[PDB]
Amino acid sequence: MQIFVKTLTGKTITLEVEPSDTIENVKAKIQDKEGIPPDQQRLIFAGKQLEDGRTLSDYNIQKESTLHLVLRL
Amino acid sequence: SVPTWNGFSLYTDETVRNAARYAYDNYLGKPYTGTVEATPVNFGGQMVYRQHHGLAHTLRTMAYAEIIVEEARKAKLRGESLKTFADGRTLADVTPEELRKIMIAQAFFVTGRDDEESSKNYEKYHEQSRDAFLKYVEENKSTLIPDVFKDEKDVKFYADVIEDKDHKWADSPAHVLVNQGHMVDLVRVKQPPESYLEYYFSQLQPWIGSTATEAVFATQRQFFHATYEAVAGFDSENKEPHLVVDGLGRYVIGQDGNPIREESSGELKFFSQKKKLEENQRYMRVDEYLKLDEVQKRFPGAGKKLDGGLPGLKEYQYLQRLNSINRARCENDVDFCLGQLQTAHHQT
Numbered sequence: 001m002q003i004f005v006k007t008l009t010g011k012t013i014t015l016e017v018e019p020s021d022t023i024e025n026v027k028a029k030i031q032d033k034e035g036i037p038p039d040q041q042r043l044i045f046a047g048k049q050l051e052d053g054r055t056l057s058d059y060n061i062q063k064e065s066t067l068h069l070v071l072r073l
Numbered sequence: 074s075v076p077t078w079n080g081f082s083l084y085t086d087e088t089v090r091n092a093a094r095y096a097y098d099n100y101l102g103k104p105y106t107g108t109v110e111a112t113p114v115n116f117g118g119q120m121v122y123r124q125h126h127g128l129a130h131t132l133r134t135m136a137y138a139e140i141i142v143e144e145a146r147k148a149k150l151r152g153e154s155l156k157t158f159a160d161g162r163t164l165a166d167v168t169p170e171e172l173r174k175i176m177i178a179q180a181f182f183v184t185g186r187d188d189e190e191s192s193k194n195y196e197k198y199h200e201q202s203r204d205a206f207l208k209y210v211e212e213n214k215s216t217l218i219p220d221v222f223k224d225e226k227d228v229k230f231y232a233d234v235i236e237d238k239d240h241k242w243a244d245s246p247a248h249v250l251v252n253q254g255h256m257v258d259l260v261r262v263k264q265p266p267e268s269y270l271e272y273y274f275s276q277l278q279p280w281i282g283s284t285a286t287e288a289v290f291a292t293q294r295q296f297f298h299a300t301y302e303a304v305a306g307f308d309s310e311n312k313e314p315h316l317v318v319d320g321l322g323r324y325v326i327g328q329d330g331n332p333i334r335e336e337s338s339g340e341l342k343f344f345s346q347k348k349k350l351e352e353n354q355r356y357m358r359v360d361e362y363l364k365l366d367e368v369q370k371r372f373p374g375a376g377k378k379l380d381g382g383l384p385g386l387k388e389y390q391y392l393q394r395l396n397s398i399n400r401a402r403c404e405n406d407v408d409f410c411l412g413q414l415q416t417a418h419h420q421t
């Protein structure tokens with residue numbers, strides 16, 4: 001399952017994930033590919049901010065879903 | 074009927090600068106008292122109490138009012154027809170004195186906020202902003218009246234704009250500049266950036282024309298760069314779902330490769346995000362929306378690609394710039410932030 005993570009700056013991060021993956025896992029993946037600290041990552045889906053502890057399937061995040069990466073300061 | 078300018082400038086006029094200082098000293102640089110994102114942030118050693126609606130935000134809105142009037146004046150001198158108010162004026166008829174008064178009001182437009190709480194405290198924060206402005210005028214009436222504000226009647230008018238009781242955002246040149254100046258600063262956070270830019274473009278364009286509007290948003294990018302604030306990308310081939318900004322909704326492509334329209338081609342039917350779709354439908358994509366020729370007619374976004382952030386900087390590196398002590402100085406030092414904006418302005 002691939003999801004797309006988009007930033008205000010116009011970057012699109014294509015991640016290979018599966019519903020089981022938690023939001024930390026996703027943030028770790030984002031750091032692996034882009035070197036963005038999980039500390040400064042804010043993931044948004046369907047206008048809702050995703051919480052670390054929970055998984056993707058908890059938010060009904062499916063294939064080809066687009067997430068927003070808002071930068072935490 | 075375009076008035077002569079007298080060298081008035083945000084970056085040299087001291088009345089306008091002193092309003093901003095007062096606003097920062099008594100309101101914008103003080104901790105939020107509310108609960109919604111009230112906790113401050115440390116940038117490179119300095120505290121910033123109001124990162125979303127603080128000094129830099131407020132100075133940028135004033136900076137927008139100035140370039141919008143400038144670009145409007147040039148538009149009308151080119152012979153363009155601009156949208157009129159109920160008395161026949163356009164933004165291009167704004168005088169130096171009027172713009173000064175507008176900018177002073179702008180400096181107080183979010184001083185009344187107790188946090189970033191949205192909608193719920195709208196009236197309270199707007200009334201508190203009005204009160205801040207009125208206290209400022211009173212304490213400085215000896216220099217402000219009658220040279221800046223003609224009388225107490227002039228004052229109330231700008232007080233009323235700030236309070237915004239009946240949300241008449243298009244009622245006068247002051248209403249448009251304050252409200253749309255405030256609005257467009259959201260280009261620094263709103264996603265998807267293409268949907269939001271097309272929407273803001275459509276709100277500003279009728280007042281000053283297309284050429285002026287392009288120039289305003291091009292200059293804004295410089296204003297963001299100069300104040301260590303995020304510069305959005307623009308990608309006409311963005312495949313993510315389009316966001317209908319008015320109502321936060323969607324458009325839908327039918328089973329047949331056709332947008333769903335109301336009986337007429339008719340308007341694209343608004344779709345709530347929540348509502349489910351009959352199988353074989355899908356949301357309209359940003360790239361699809363931009364190449365709709367009703368959109369291309371009013372917005373030159375199709376075929377356009379703009380790089381966000383700072384070219385040559387990897388995204389994480391751009392973060393460090395945004396998180397820098399320079400951002401903090403912009404949020405806490407009137408002269409520095411205005412200095413950053415002035416350089417951006419010249420760069421043209």
Ligand SMILES: Nc1ncnc2c1ncn2[C@@H]1O[C@H](COP(=O)(O)O)[C@@H](O)[C@H]1O
Nearest residue numbers: 191242243249251252253255256259276
């Ligand atoms: N279409 C519009 N035209 C003029 N001003 C607007 C428009 N949309 C939003 N605004 C302004 O932006 C404010 C909302 O700012 P915010 O609290 O950041 O959502 C409104 O209360 C208006 O002052």
